[PDB]
Amino acid sequence: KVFGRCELAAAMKRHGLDNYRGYSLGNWVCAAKFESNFNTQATNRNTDGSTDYGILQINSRWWCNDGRTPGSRNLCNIPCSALLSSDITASVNCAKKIVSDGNGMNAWVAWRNRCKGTDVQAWIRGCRL
Ligand SMILES: [Cl-]
Ligand SMILES: [Cl-]
Ligand SMILES: [Cl-]
Ligand code: NA
Ligand SMILES: [Ru+3]
Ligand SMILES: [Ru+3]
Ligand SMILES: [Ru+3]
């Protein structure tokens, strides 16, 4: 599923991301925009052989099992395929664990490079949440 911007903002808020670990909803929408262009099915191979999955590009090196990332953990206890579903529950739940893990949203390199420090509120401007 490719979400619209306000549609995903609304879904993210419903699933408990607004101000989760202190990150306003616009941060999450901005991260999703630049990680996956709001497409739940996005997948991208990393140089190290891991792959990133879903609307938030969650990495198989640490967070999910895809059966092809040697040496990796599965800290969200889910198949990476679950991260591709039209329902964002697994992505959101796993993202909560990631953002709790110590470096906050800097875990998403696109968030650090494209969202952090910017007017992230613009991403939810005009939305009926
Ligand atoms: Cl957009
Ligand atoms: Cl933080
Ligand atoms: Cl980037
Ligand atoms: Na893994
Ligand atoms: Ru809010
Ligand atoms: Ru990545
Ligand atoms: Ru939902």
Side-chain angles (χ1 to χ4, degrees), residues 8 13 21 26 31 38 46-47 69 73 78 83 123:
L8 180 65
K13 186 175 180 303
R21 284 266 166 150
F38 307 140
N46 303 316
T47 50
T69 310
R73 307 273 276 121
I78 43 167
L83 300 170
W123 289 101

Side-chain angles (χ1 to χ4, degrees), residues 16-66:
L17 285 177
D18 192 15
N19 218 14
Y20 187 89
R21 284 266 166 150
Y23 285 98
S24 74
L25 199 55
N27 281 283
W28 293 104
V29 173
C30 186
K33 174 68 179 180
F34 296 125
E35 290 292 355
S36 65
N37 207 15
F38 307 140
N39 182 358
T40 67
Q41 299 194 71
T43 59
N44 290 288
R45 202 77 187 256
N46 303 316
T47 50
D48 75 359
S50 62
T51 296
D52 289 349
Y53 295 87
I55 197 124
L56 292 158
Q57 290 292 278
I58 292 169
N59 186 291
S60 62
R61 185 168 157 167
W62 297 102
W63 306 104
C64 62
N65 176 57
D66 64 7

Side-chain angles (χ1 to χ4, degrees), residues 27-127:
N27 281 283
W28 293 104
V29 173
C30 186
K33 174 68 179 180
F34 296 125
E35 290 292 355
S36 65
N37 207 15
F38 307 140
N39 182 358
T40 67
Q41 299 194 71
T43 59
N44 290 288
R45 202 77 187 256
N46 303 316
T47 50
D48 75 359
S50 62
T51 296
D52 289 349
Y53 295 87
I55 197 124
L56 292 158
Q57 290 292 278
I58 292 169
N59 186 291
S60 62
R61 185 168 157 167
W62 297 102
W63 306 104
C64 62
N65 176 57
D66 64 7
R68 65 165 204 199
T69 310
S72 72
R73 307 273 276 121
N74 177 7
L75 299 166
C76 291
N77 308 298
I78 43 167
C80 294
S81 65
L83 300 170
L84 303 177
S85 174
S86 53
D87 188 294
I88 69 172
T89 301
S91 282
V92 170
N93 290 345
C94 183
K96 290 175 169 169
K97 286 204 190 63
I98 297 165
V99 74
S100 304
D101 207 47
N103 308 291
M105 285 194 73
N106 300 287
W108 289 276
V109 154
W111 174 88
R112 179 170 53 83
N113 286 329
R114 308 181 72 176
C115 298
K116 183 180 186 180
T118 76
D119 184 12
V120 298
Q121 177 280 157
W123 289 101
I124 65 163
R125 251 218 284 291
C127 307

